Structure formats: structure tokens, C-alpha cells
Design a protein around this ligand. Structure first.
Ligand code: HEC
Ligand code: HEC
Lengths: 126, 126
């Protein structure tokens, strides 16, 4: 859907900004510093679920740029494993949110965060 | 969810980038230049439906900036009407996509686009 590779970069960076905000805005809730409203979090995690699928389609062939390492492309199956682990952990976060349990939410949240970092460590430029 | 007003600006601009891409990427389909796959469009419009709700929460009090005119805040009920007309036209686009009819899709698409422009004409800086 991108006229030029720059447009894929812009898209993925914007998708990531959104995803990161819908993830990170729950940090005070999982830490107990903000109240836990099960319906509020369930709705937010449904947004996050949609957003979490969007970046990966904007690393198509030819869309090198931004802070993406070239190894994303050179090792496409390996990158896909990092993406899949992350998406599987989002499924578990959805489950915890749907169950309305803060202890399960905080565990699932931490698993997602670990998956974010693992992909960055391999595939995001310093 | 924003630490500083700048963060709301960044969020809304990213939300808009996404929304615009999921809207605009259908232009070749509504024009007939790309094939019409009803399932593909139904899925894309479901993404668009989620995205189309996101910008408006990031024009909260105190988040003046970017290319937002100050009248967004000064005339909050009026801005809300432009936002609601747009969101109602998204509901109609979802209906057309769910119905699998390209003639209804192209009409609903044009209605959404008109709603985008109407809000810009009043509330987006030149
Ligand atoms: C690989 C499978 C990744 C996973 C999982 C996550 N991120 Fe990511 N991130 C990745 C790349 C390759 C890049 C660079 C994209 C580019 O072209 O520039 C990024 C970048 C970020 C950024 C920078 C800001 C931005 O681009 O808007 C942030 C803040 C970021 N990533 C956050 C983030 C979070 C919170 C994640 C899990 C919820 C996450 N990323 C997962 C690769 C991958
Ligand atoms: C008001 C109810 C709006 C509707 C409906 C749409 N847009 Fe919008 N748009 C609006 C404002 C106030 C702004 C400026 C935001 C800021 O703080 O800078 C914008 C901006 C854009 C942009 C610029 C790029 C960006 O911010 O990423 C684009 C490309 C854009 N808008 C597109 C767009 C489309 C395609 C719309 C309907 C599908 C649409 N906008 C609706 C206000 C409003």
C-alpha cells in the first residue's frame, strides 16, 4: 500500500508509536499505581490486539530504512519467529484481560514486554 | 495516557497516518484499477474502524499543538459534530464492506472522504 519505501517506514513507525502507547499506558495499572477497571483494560487490550498485528506488514521487500536492521530481510524466518512469539504473547494478554484478573494481567504484560525487547536486541538499530 | 502534550500530538499524528493509509489504500479498488476482493476489503475496513476512533481521544484539554486549530477546543461541541459525522460515515463504510458490494463501497468511501475534508476545512491549520 506504499508508494515509496519511505511510506512503509513512516507507516511502521506510526504503527509502533500507537502500539507502544496502548501497551505502555497500562504500566501504572499493572504496577497498582492506577486503579484496575477490568472493562477499561479489556477494551484497551482489544485495541492493542489490532495494533500489534500492523507493523509487520510494513517490512515488505524493498522497505529497508528507519531503525530496521538489514537482518530483518536477510533472516526473514528468524525475524518471523520473534514477531510470532510477540503476537502469541499478545494472545495471552488478551486472555488475561478477558479474564479480568490483575495478577494474570501483570504476568502476561511482562511476557509481552520481554518479547518486545528480545526483538529489539536482534533487529533494531542502536 | 500522555506524559506531556507533545506526546498527545505525536500520538494523534501517528493515529492519523495509520487511518489515512487504511483509507487511502482502497482508492485503486473503489476506482476499479485494482481487483475487488470482498473479504480483503471487509478485513481492511475492520482495521479502519478501530483506527478511526483513535485520534479524537488525543485532543484532550491542554494538548494544543501540531496542525490542530485552537478552535477544536474553543468550539468543542462543533468539533465533536464533525468527528461524529465522520464516525457515522465509517459505520456506513463498514456496512458496505460487510455487504460485499463495490457500488455501495464506492459511495460510502466517497462519503467518508467528504467528512475528512469537511473537518480539515474548519479545524486543520493551513
Ligand atoms: C520485532 C518482531 C519487534 C517486536 C516484537 C517489537 N518491536 Fe519495536 N521495533 C522493531 C523494529 C525493527 C523497530 C524499528 C522500526 C523502524 O523502521 O524504525 C522498532 C522500533 C520501536 C520503537 C521506536 C519508535 C517507533 O518506531 O515509533 C519503539 C518505541 C518500539 N519499537 C516499541 C516496541 C514495543 C513497546 C513493543 C512491544 C509491545 C515492540 N516494540 C515490539 C521491532 C520489534
Ligand atoms: C476532524 C473531526 C477530522 C476528521 C474527520 C479527519 N481529520 Fe485528518 N486532521 C484533523 C486535524 C485536526 C489534523 C491535525 C492534527 C495535528 O495535531 O497535527 C488532521 C491531520 C491530518 C493529516 C496530516 C498528517 C498527520 O497528522 O498524520 C492527514 C493526512 C489527515 N488528517 C487525513 C485524514 C483522513 C484521510 C481523514 C478521513 C479518513 C481525516 N483526516 C479525517 C482533523 C480531522
Amino acid at each position: 500500500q506504499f508508494a515509496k519505501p519511505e511510506d512503509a517506514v513512516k507507516y511502521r513507525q506510526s504503527a509502533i508509536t500507537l502500539m507502544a502507547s496502548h501497551f505502555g499506558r497500562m504500566t501504572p495499572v499493572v504496577k497498582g499505581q492506577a486503579p484496575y477497571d477490568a472493562a477499561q483494560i479489556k477494551a484497551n487490550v482489544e485495541v492493542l490486539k489490532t495494533l500489534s498485528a500492523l507493523p509487520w506488514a510494513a517490512f515488505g521487500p524493498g522497505t529497508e530504512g528507519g531503525d530496521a536492521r538489514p537482518e530483518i530481510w536477510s533472516d526473514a524466518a528468524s525475524f518471523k519467529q520473534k514477531q510470532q512469539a510477540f503476537q502469541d504473547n499478545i494472545v495471552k494478554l488478551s486472555a488475561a484481560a478477558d479474564a479480568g484478573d490483575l495478577d494474570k494481567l501483570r504476568a502476561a504484560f511482562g511476557d509481552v514486554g520481554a518479547s518486545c525487547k528480545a526483538c529489539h536486541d536482534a533487529y533494531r538499530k542502536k
